[PDB]
């Protein structure tokens, strides 16, 4: 039992839980080395 808004929030939170693309490490001024990753057990969503 979910609402549409909760489900959309969950979908957005799911689409953000991926590693960075590797080619971004090759850019000219890149300071990132890895991804704000979230684990369902380690950290809980704001609900």
């Amino acid at each position: 039992h979910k609402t549409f808004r909760i489900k959309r929030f969950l979908a957005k939170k799911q689409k953000q839980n991926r590693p960075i693309p590797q080619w971004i490490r090759m850019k000219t001024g890149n300071k990132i080395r890895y991804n704000k990753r979230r684990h369902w057990r380690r950290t809980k969503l704001g609900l």
Partner: protein, 73 residues
């Protein structure tokens, strides 16, 4: 049994997401107070997109001109 045992009975949410401020602010006016300047600066004009005020600044720098175009080639 007021500690660990009582923490297991946590099933019903007091709060949910707000439709105006998005936090988990029905009064027409916004909730803001002078005794928390940190809270005031966490949400103020400039912490968002300003998707209308920046254009206002750009148009002020030229006198709010409208109905004209740069001279055609």
């Amino acid at each position: 049994t007021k500690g660990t045992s009582s923490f297991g009975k946590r099933r019903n949410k007091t709060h949910t997401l707000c439709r105006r401020c998005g936090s988990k602010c029905p009064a027409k006016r916004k909730r803001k107070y002078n005794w928390s300047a940190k809270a005031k600066r966490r949400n103020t004009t400039g912490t968002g997109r300003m998707r209308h005020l920046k254009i206002v600044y750009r148009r002020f720098r030229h006198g709010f001109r409208e109905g004209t175009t740069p001279k055609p080639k």
